[PDB]
Paper text:
In the nucleus of the infected cell, influenza polymerase (FluPol) uses the viral genomic RNA (vRNA) as template to perform synthesis of either capped and polyadenylated viral mRNA (transcription), or unmodified anti-genomic copies (complementary or cRNA), which then serve as the template for vRNA synthesis (replication). ANP32 is required for both vRNA to cRNA and cRNA to vRNA replication. ANP32 comprises a folded, N-terminal leucine-rich repeat (LRR) domain followed by a Glu-, Asp-rich intrinsically disordered region known as the low complexity acidic region (LCAR). First, it stabilises the formation of the replication complex, an asymmetric FluPol dimer comprising a replicase, which is part of a parental RNP and synthesises the genome copy and an encapsidase, a newly synthesised apo-FluPol, which binds the 5’ end of the nascent RNA replicate to nucleate formation of a progeny RNP.
Author numbering:
A (entry chain C): 44 to 488, 493 to 742
B (entry chain A): 1 to 61, 72 to 715
C (entry chain B): 1 to 185, 205 to 641, 654 to 668
């Protein structure tokens, strides 16, 4: 058994093989009663055995060795991590996925080499003196050799590791793996997350340090603003407030939006909400329209879908011509009542034109598109509201492209030299989708003000809808710059640690106002936006009980003057949620309040937790590892009264540890106690206390 | 070198050579060497057939050349066309691959591009082939050897010589000539002669009716056995038939009816540790995971009343159990765990020796002595006893699937989720853990895994010592309080486990609140004393000590350490269901699956029966039930369960087919029923599975109407 | 109220929840003691299905030989190995007609692969029966021992490097009057054996009970062959694989996504090819006594027919392996244990002394077994097993035979067609006709045809139902939705090398199990959690803020307090777990590098760290993995 073989090595005094010399003796013979190394007189090997904890000692107090050039040695792993970091994640789709077994070069390579040639070059890079007889791959591969000489110079790392990493980046490692539409080497390293046996995930590996940092940041910022606004009632005021109180690391978002004419939809929506200038063009998701000729009327009627359901739709009737475009690929579309007359496109990336054409199909309202639906089309939105029928078909066919292609039908491509057809996979062929043709004569691709409504929809001066709140692309990504925000309403974006830190900072800064309002005794001080954001991380099932306990303890704190700043700060954030008392009418009781994420994400009610700690000797508040001083708001009597009267509801201190009364009492029996009875509790190890219930 | 290969050869040549390699299945990147050779070969076989054509009458100079290339194209097509030419022209077909065919001499060309001297290479190619083909060997040292006179004129020979003029030096000047591998190496092994002894073995390895191997080879090569299958089928007896039989709900009789026979004893309790009757002595702690011995000492200190008991009331005695010895062993365990010494070793005393079964293995003697002896005979193997249904298994299933106000799982953390896939994974884990963590089955599994880990560690590290191993667990209630639960104590015997199946005996004394006399048939294996009473819910509930002798090997302990895998089997399962309901809807259905939404109502599963009526539970309830089923599969897993599941899967699939109105057929139903029934001997889970299968089959029959 | 787990199936299809019926959480069955009983049972069963064939005495080894092929046709439904050569040839010829040139092309491909193959390839196999010591040893060790032995006897073919000279030496060794070899008696020694004894040892087979087999109540024995035949079986299997790759109905060799794709494509093709108004029915079959009933002589004929248009030398090379298999001899294992309970005494009777005691002292089962084995027994303790294929090792060739049987597609121009998929010992047979009765007639004709070729479909385990749902090699199909490939999910535990390469191996195995085998996102994340828990428990490196106490954990806590940036710490040092589905493939050290502060980062990445010491090319890479030569790359004692 290999797994068991080392669970017993740790029991050994020294299971590891120590080196010889200075680094052998840098770790002491013993440390705090723990053995690290030994002086064993081996027979003829001169060997020395080192402990297991010695690695921890090296990490803590070990000499700080030189690490220069380490990043250069492991350039392959660093490039992998940068590709992952600089990547953008798309939608996740559920459905049938067909994968084929292929030899697809698991990992990337700086330059693909045969094993012997790779060994020769490596020998040259590391040991030119010991290379032996000069070779020929040394001649031809001079460029890579010279670059690696320039790179691995000066590093003190062992040459064997350098050679191994060089082999990793040179020697190919090919294996048979299943692939479904992702064959690039950059994709295989994430093939595990790319798609399973019943779902697909869109992954776009990052490239270089792209220059469009500001645009990439503001796009995601505005997207989040929209996501937060849509769910909340009256997205208008909340969205404008958020966009006004957001800063891209040096400046407000508004200034950037005015400066750069970027964005696809979210920037336009935010600009309109703030009253700025935007480009004039209709959108239906990733595809934008620019009417050129014709007109149509909107009529509401029922239609039959292939799956066999009836739902009302406002269809557009009349001849129309559009300068349709999607991503980078341009084109022109002819639309009429239930017919796609003719479509022209240009050459571009296959996915770009695929999205273009499918979006034209769904927008065109062709009867074939109605008949090309098989599965249920009950898709939902982020707010949980049913999507409009047209956007429902758009999403369904984006998640399912083969079905519409098969159902639509093909025809013969035109005989013009520059006009040619395309297959389901965008492959040129005589059989082309009806009304769809490729072309080579590229068509060439200025601001106004647009009003906004409650539902974050742009409506022109005459009232036509130009941008819909459902057109926001779901391509999630990470901003290249460290954006910051001030509003509490959006703090849920950050990690629970960050949210807790932000809310505690907010309550600490305005502690005076909170105390002044609390002393009065109303309830509007429990409804602050910061607490609204904080309620997100509290679990719903226990949120009511937590809030009831917090309200009860604060009320007991206020009624009898045992006011303690630490406990007030700790338990204020939980008081938002409506109280949920027991059937007996008494508030629940707790030892520690658990938050979302489990584990460390818990606040201790008695001693302190990693997310909240107090040092009264130095009067220091440690929130999530960050230290602050509470001078000026801490009273000497507060230092005196430690914790006894602010841990339990309806209980107060009456004495000290009395072993005669009994051991420490748990909550199960504490809740069942009757007025006029004295019990004993434990704050933390070595600090017991006695309490008594008060009516 | 590939960048250099592309220079001398166009993309079509490279791709044809790479495809020809693809019919070899060795990494093309590994050795371009022969790739070079083959492409060169291919190249020459094309240059010999570049501008040389023939007319409809035979003019040497329309839509017909004077040559036809074989190399490069797929092997199957190449061979089919080669055979076509051979049969059309009535010429002997070479037994090796053909590289090029001529239209004037009607012969198959073979070409070889060698490094050094050509004549010797020509003779070696003749040795390989002989005279079945005409050979055109070329060598970069301006060397050539052609076996035919008028195969090609001087123009083609000069052209090919010029074409090889660059490659004879171009590789050297850019320093490539050195690593150029020859062409004979890939075909060094051609000679293979059988010895006399192997020849005789082949001769006697001929099918019946043939004198020797030569006759067999001649027969197989010459005779055309058309109609053999039809003739033999016609003359085969009709008795050899599959006996088709359309399946119907009537044919599906209950499986293993003997479990309804009351004469057989009801299947007794045999799980390693108590599962639903466990009574954990709870001690409140707020942190440090102290030593097992220290934890047991503290827990017993809290309940000194139970610990200090010394006048027990013997309630149940097993058939072959020594009550005095068991009680003395229990007292020794308690005293040792309650002493100040860190060591938890028990002196090898008489009662300890009996409980551990010291010195029971039979002595080994020489084979000759046994052979001489007459009274030494191979013992008849013990067969598992037949048992009937027992209600305690149903009670276990019902109780362990019920939610409890505790949490035993303490799974670690993972990195923050970023991509949508990890978001949905986190959602699914959140729901599944929120449901499972509050179930009794999870706590039982944690107890099992922790005890097995401790037992394996002790057996491996204390082979020759008797050790007392407390049965301990760490639990956390909904309010955040942490408790240490002591369920009992285990004595570990000698564990000189050499083989994987070597058995070490463990004596388990486990606290419980169930009076065994309530269900006597459930406790024939357990010696039960009444050690005391406790105040719990306003009542003085009795506390008994179930004492038993069990045994485990290395494999069982290692699998117990891995009992957490049950989670996975459950998780995957439910995940599949979620995935399925995503397919029907096209978007994440996890929230709709668990809690529902405005569009889709929460999912429900038929769970069980109440007063003979089918009842339905929520998604979480079904998850918990399948999790307890996985835990049961663990605790009651053995060959019987494997056989029963494997054989009953077919019956389940047939029932599914009947439900789908797929008119399933069977070929031998009685055989399948016998295969299913022979596995139902004494495993409690197997018996209860048979009972549940009968009940569910009855309900399905009722529904089918 | 009484719960009933099976009631789940009332609301969900069985296939959708088939995983519930697989008890893979339980301890797999394990065999105790000797495997001689099962080996004798296998020998008896193999000789029972062929006793009616021609029986004679081998003139090379003196063993009893039973040859069923060309024997009388069966008259009952019991397993029958009396395959007819004419029918096999007809099936192969028909398959050639459906695949023109496939046989000769595959023969040429295998022959050239065999030219380029080297002796070292033989080291890629699993345990093999070394005859110099008569025990199962790793393939490389057996190859080294046999090469040294051949060196001692003036057989230096392996020196040439190619596989052809090595196999030539192998066959020539059978001609040597006496052979000298290195044995272990422990110390190394030179021992000499006669020609007949060497022949028997080379043809001998080692037998052992199969352990940890799922879904089988009773244990079964398996056989490991010697190193001599590994080359010939390798080339034969390469030839059969080349044939299978081009066969549409061959359910091999790819697994996973291509498997489901092949199942669905076959089903759809089968529906589409149904005459209007007819019916399609699928038979899920299981072959009983698959290994036992197949005869090596039939495989010899198969190889001869496949290499019809191949050079004589290659025909001989292919034919060798069936010849040796047809003359194989089986070792009976360790023997039997006889015990006297009164005296509490036990004694092991080895195989040679099996009959040294009167059979009355054996139990009934062993008594009957030995009584039936008597004729096939040998004085040295081995049994003649001329029929049967106990070791398998012809999965590709057996699959070819099954596909050829599937290729007939009709008998007597009857009104039904049949096709399907075949993989080793499992198959799904689709039949189209005008009515279900005609489909059953066609299935009966297929059963008779399979009987004729030495394949016995199991009537007890097979079944039929209207096309649309079926099972194949643990893959369940129901209306397009294929459930999964039910496979024993492994223990995501400590890999067991060091601290860092351990984590690398764990994450790589999670990634591979996700990418190759069936596992979804939530399952993989729970897998990561479980693996991290086991890793932390094994190395006692729980989180720095984790209040667990321990010897090393104390210094870990001291580090945690000392540390300022806790985000960039390895789990080996009590750091937070950062791994997820996205970053499964990336080593943790590079992930956290940007976060780790120099105070500890410098110590971790110490060039001359005193732990790793001298490294080897195997050490960093040896399956392969990615890691950093830090302080967590230490080695064993």
């Amino acid at each position: 058994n290999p797994s068991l073989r080392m669970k017993w090595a740790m029991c050994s005094n020294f299971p590891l093989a120590l080196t010889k010399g200075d680094m052998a003796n840098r770790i002491p013979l013993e440390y705090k009663g723990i053995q690290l190394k030994t002086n064993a007189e081996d027979i003829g090997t001169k060997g020395q055995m080192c402990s297991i904890a010695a690695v921890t000692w090296w990490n803590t107090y070990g000499p700080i060795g030189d690490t220069e050039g380490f990043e250069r040695v492991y350039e392959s792993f660093f490039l992998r991590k940068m590709r992952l970091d600089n990547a953008t994640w798309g939608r996740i789709t559920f459905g049938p996925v067909e994968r084929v077994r292929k030899r697809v070069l698991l990992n990337p390579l700086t330059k693909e080499m045969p094993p012997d040639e790779a060994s020769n070059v490596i020998m040259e890079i590391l040991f030119p003196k010991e290379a032996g007889i000069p070779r020929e791959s040394t001649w031809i591969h001079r460029e890579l050799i010279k670059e690696k000489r320039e790179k691995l110079k000066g590093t003190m790392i062992t040459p064997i590791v350098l050679a191994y990493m060089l082999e990793r980046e040179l020697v190919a490692r090919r294996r048979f793996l299943p692939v479904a539409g992702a064959t690039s080497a950059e994709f295989i390293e994430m093939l595990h997350c790319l798609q399973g046996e019943n779902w697909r995930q869109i992954y776009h590996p990052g490239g270089n340090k792209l220059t469009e940092s500001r645009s990439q940041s503001m796009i995601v910022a505005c997207r989040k603003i929209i996501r937060r606004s849509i769910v909340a009632s009256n997205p208008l005021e909340l969205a404008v407030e958020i966009a006004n109180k957001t800063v891209i690391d040096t400046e407000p978002l508004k200034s950037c939006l005015a400066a750069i004419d970027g964005g696809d939809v979210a920037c336009d929506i935010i600009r309109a909400a703030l009253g700025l200038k935007i480009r004039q063009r209709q959108r239906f998701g990733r595809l934008e329209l620019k009417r050129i000729s014709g007109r149509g009327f909107k009529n509401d009627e029922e239609i039959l879908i292939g799956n066999g359901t009836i739902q009302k739709i406002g269809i557009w009737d009349g001849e129309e011509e559009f300068h349709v475009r999607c991503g980078e690929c341009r084109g022109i579309l002819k639309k009429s009542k239930m017919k796609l007359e003719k479509l022209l496109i240009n050459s571009a990336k296959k996915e770009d034109m695929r999205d273009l054409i499918i979006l034209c199909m769904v927008f065109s309202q062709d009867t074939r598109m109605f008949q090309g639906v098989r599965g249920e089309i009950n898709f939902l939105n982020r707010a949980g509201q049913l999507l409009s029928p047209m956007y429902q078909l758009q999403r369904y066919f984006l998640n399912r492209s083969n079905d519409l292609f098969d159902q639509w039908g093909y025809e013969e491509s035109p005989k013009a030299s520059e006009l040619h057809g395309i297959n389901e996979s965008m492959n040129a062929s005589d059989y082309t989708l009806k009304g769809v043709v490729v072309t080579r004569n590229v068509i060439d691709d200025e601001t106004e003000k647009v009003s906004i409504t409650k539902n974050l929809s742009l409506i022109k001066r005459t009232g036509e809808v130009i941008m819909g709140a459902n057109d926001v692309s779901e391509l999630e990504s990470q901003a290249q710059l460290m954006i910051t925000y001030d509003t509490p309403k959006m703090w849920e974006m950050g990690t629970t640690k960050e949210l807790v830190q932000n809310t505690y900072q907010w309550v600490l800064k305005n502690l005076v106002t909170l105390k002044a309002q609390f002393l009065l005794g109303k309830e509007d001080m429990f409804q602050w936006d910061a607490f609204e954001a904080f309620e997100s991380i509290i679990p719903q099932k226990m949120a009511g009980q937590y809030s009831g306990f917090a309200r009860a303890v604060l009320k007991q704190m206020r009624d009898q003057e045992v006011m303690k700043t630490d406990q007030f700060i700790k338990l204020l954030p939980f008081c938002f949620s409506p109280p949920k008392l027991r059937s007996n009418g008494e508030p629940y009781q707790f030892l520690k309040l658990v938050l979302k994420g489990g584990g460390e994400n818990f606040i201790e009610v008695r001693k302190g937790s990693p997310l909240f700690s107090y040092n009264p000797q130095t009067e220091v508040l440690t929130i999530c590892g960050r230290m602050m001083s509470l001078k000026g708001k801490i009273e000497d009597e507060e230092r005196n009264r430690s914790m006894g009267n602010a841990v339990l509801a309806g209980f107060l201190v009456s004495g000290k540890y009395d072993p005669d009364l009994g051991d420490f009492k748990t909550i199960e029996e504490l809740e069942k106690l009757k007025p006029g009875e004295k019990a004993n509790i434990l704050l933390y190890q070595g600090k017991p206390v006695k309490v008594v219930k008060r009516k | 070198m590939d960048t250099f290969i592309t220079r001398n050869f166009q993309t079509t040549i490279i791709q044809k050579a790479k495809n020809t390699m693809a019919e070899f299945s060795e990494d093309p990147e590994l050795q371009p060497a022969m790739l070079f050779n083959i492409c060169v070969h291919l190249e020459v076989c094309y240059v010999i057939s570049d501008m040389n054509f023939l007319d409809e009458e035979g003019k040497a100079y329309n839509l017909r050349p004077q040559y036809e290339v074989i190399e490069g194209m797929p092997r199957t097509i190449a061979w089919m066309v080669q055979r076509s030419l051979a049969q059309e022209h009535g010429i002997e077909t070479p037994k090796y691959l053909a590289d090029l065919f001529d239209y004037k001499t009607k012969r198959f060309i073979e070409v070889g591009i060698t490094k050094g001297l050509a004549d010797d290479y020509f003779w070696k190619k003749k040795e390989k082939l002989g005279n079945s083909m005409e050979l055109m060997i070329f060598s970069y040292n301006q060397d050539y050897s052609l076996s035919n006179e008028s195969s090609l004129d001087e123009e083609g020979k000069g052209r090919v010589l010029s074409r090889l003029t660059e490659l004879q030096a171009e590789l050297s000047l850019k320093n490539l000539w050195q690593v150029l591998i020859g062409e004979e190496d890939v075909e060094k092994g051609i000679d293979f002669k059988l010895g006399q002894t192997i020849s005789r073995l082949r001769d006697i390895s001929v099918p019946a009716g043939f004198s020797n191997f030569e006759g067999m080879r001649s027969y197989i090569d010459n005779i055309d056995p058309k109609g053999a299958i039809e003739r033999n089928l016609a003359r085969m007896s009709p008795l050899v038939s599959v006996t088709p039989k359309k399946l119907t709900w009537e044919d599906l009789r209950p499986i293993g009816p003997h479990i309804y026979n009351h004469e057989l004893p009801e299947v007794p309790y045999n799980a390693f540790l108590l599962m639903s009757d466990e009574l954990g002595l709870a001690n409140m702690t707020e942190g440090k995971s102290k030593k097992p011995k220290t934890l047991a000492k503290e827990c017993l200190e809290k309940y000194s009343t139970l610990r200090d008991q010394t006048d027990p009331i013997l309630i149940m005695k097993s058939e072959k159990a020594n009550e005095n010895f068991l009680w003395k062993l229990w007292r020794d365990c308690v005293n040792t765990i309650s002493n100040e010494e860190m060591s938890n070793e028990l002196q090898k005393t008489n009662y300890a020796k009996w409980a551990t079964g010291d010195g029971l293995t039979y002595q080994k003697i020489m084979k000759e002595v046994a052979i001489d002896d007459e009274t030494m005979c191979q013992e008849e193997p013990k067969i598992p006893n037949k048992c009937r249904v027992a209600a305690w298994v149903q009670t276990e299933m019902n109780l362990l699937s019920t939610l409890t106000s505790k949490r035993a799982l303490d799974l670690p953390e993972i990195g923050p989720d970023v991509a949508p896939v990890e978001h949905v994974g986190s959602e699914r884990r959140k729901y599944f853990v929120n449901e499972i963590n509050y179930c009794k089955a999870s706590t039982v599994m944690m107890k099992y895994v922790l005890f097995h880990t401790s037992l394996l560690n002790e057996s491996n590290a204390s082979m020759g010592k008797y050790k007392v191993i407390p049965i301990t667990n760490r639990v956390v209630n909904e309010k955040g309080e942490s408790f240490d639960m002591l369920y009992g104590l285990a004595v570990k015997g000698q564990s000189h486990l050499r083989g994987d199946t070597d058995v070490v005996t463990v004596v388990t004394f486990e606290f419980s609140s169930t009076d065994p006399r309530v269900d006597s048939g459930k406790w024939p294996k357990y010696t039960v004393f009444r050690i005391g009473s406790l105040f719990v819910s306003g009542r003085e509930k009795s506390v008994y000590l179930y004492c038993r002798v069990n045994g485990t090997n290395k494999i069982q302990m290692k699998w117990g350490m891995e009992a957490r895998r049950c989670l996975l089997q459950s998780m995957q399962q439910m995940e599949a269901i979620v995935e399925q309901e995503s397919s029907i809807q096209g978007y994440d259905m996890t929230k709709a699956c668990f809690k529902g939404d405005r569009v889709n109502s929460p999912k429900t599963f038929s769970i069980g029966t109440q007063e003979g009526k089918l009842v339905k539970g929520s998604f979480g309830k079904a998850l918990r039930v399948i999790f307890t089923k996985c835990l049961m599969h663990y605790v009651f897993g053995n060959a019987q369960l494997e056989g029963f599941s494997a054989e009953s899967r077919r019956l389940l699939l047939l029932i599914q087919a009947l439900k789908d109105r797929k008119g399933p057929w069977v070929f031998d139903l009685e055989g399948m029923y016998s295969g299913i029934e022979e596995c139902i001997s004494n495993n409690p889970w197997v018996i209860q599975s048979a009972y549940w299968f009968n009940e569910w089959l009855g309900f399905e029959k009722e529904g089918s109407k | 109220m009484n719960i009933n787990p099976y009631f789940l199936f009332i609301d969900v299809p069985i296939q959708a929840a088939i995983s519930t019926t697989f008890p893979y959480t339980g301890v797999p069955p394990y065999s105790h003691g000797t495997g001689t009983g099962y080996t004798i049972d296998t020998v008896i069963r193999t000789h029972e299905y062929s006793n009616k064939g021609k029986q004679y005495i081998s003139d090379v080894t003196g063993c009893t030989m039973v040859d069923p092929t060309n024997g009388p046709l069966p008259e009952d439904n019991e397993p029958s190995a009396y395959a007819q050569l004419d029918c096999v040839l007809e099936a192969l010829d028909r398959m050639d007609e459906e695949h023109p040139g496939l046989f000769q092309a595959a023969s040429q491909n295998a022959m050239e692969t065999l030219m380029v193959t080297t002796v070292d390839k033989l080291t890629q196999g699993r345990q093999t029966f070394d005859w110099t010591v008569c025990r199962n040893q790793p393939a490389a060790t057996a190859l080294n021992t046999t090469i040294t032995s051949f060196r001692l006897n003036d057989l230096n073919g392996a020196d040439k490097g190619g596989l052809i000279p090595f196999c030539q030496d192998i066959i020539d060794s059978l001609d040597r009057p006496e052979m000298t070899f290195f044995s272990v008696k422990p110390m190394k020694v030179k021992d000499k054996i006669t020609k007949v004894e060497y022949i028997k040892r080379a043809l001998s087979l080692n037998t052992m009970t199969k352990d940890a087999e799922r879904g089988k109540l009773k244990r079964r024995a398996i056989a490991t062959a010697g190193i001599q035949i590994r080359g010939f079986v390798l080339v034969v299997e390469n030839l059969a694989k080349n044939i299978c790759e081009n066969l549409e109905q061959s359910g091999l060799p790819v697994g996973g996504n291509e498997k489901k794709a092949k199942l669905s494509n076959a089903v759809a093709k089968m529906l589409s090819n149904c005459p209007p108004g007819g019916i399609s029915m699928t038979v899920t079959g299981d072959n009983t006594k698959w290994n036992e009933c197949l005869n090596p002589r039939i495989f010899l004929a198969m190889t001869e027919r496949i290499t019809r248009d191949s050079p004589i030398w290659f025909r001989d090379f292919c034919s060798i392996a069936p010849v040796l298999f047809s003359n194989k001899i089986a070792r009976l294992g360790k023997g039997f244990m006889i015990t006297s309970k009164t005296k509490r005494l036990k004694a092991q009777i080895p195989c040679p002394d099996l009959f040294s005691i009167p059979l009355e002292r054996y139990n009934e089962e062993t008594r009957a077994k030995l009584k039936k084995l008597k004729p096939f027994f040998n004085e040295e303790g081995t049994a003649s097993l001329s029929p049967g294929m106990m070791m398998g090792m012809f999965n590709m060739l057996s699959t070819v035979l099954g596909v050829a049987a599937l290729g007939i597609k009709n008998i007597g121009n009857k009104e039904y067609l049949w096709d399907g998929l075949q993989s080793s010992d499992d198959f799904a047979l689709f039949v189209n006709a005008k009515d279900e009765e005609t489909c059953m007639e066609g299935i009966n004709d297929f059963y008779r045809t399979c009987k004729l070729l030495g394949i016995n479909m199991s009537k007890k385990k097979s079944y039929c139902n209207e096309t649309g749902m079926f099972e194949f090699t643990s893959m369940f199909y129901r209306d397009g939705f294929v459930s999964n490939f039910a496979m024993e999910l492994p223990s995501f535990g400590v890999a067991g090398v060091n601290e860092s390469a351990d984590m690398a191996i764990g994450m790589t195995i999670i990634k591979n199990n996700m990418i190759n085998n069936g596992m979804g996102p939530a399952t993989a994340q729970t897998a990561i959690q479980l693996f991290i828990a086991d890793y932390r428990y094994t190395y006692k490196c729980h989180r720095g803020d984790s209040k667990v106490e321990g010897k090393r954990m104390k210094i870990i806590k001291e580090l945690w307090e000392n540390t300022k940036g806790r985000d960039g710490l390895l789990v080996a040092d009590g750091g937070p777990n950062i791994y997820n589905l996205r970053n499964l493939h990336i080593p943790e050290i590079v992930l956290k590098y940007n976060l780790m502060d120099p105070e500890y980062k410098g110590r971790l990445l110490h060039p001359q760290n005193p732990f790793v010491g001298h490294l080897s090319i195997e050490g960093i890479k040896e399956m392969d993995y990615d890691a950093v030569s830090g302080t967590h790359s230490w080695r064993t004692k």
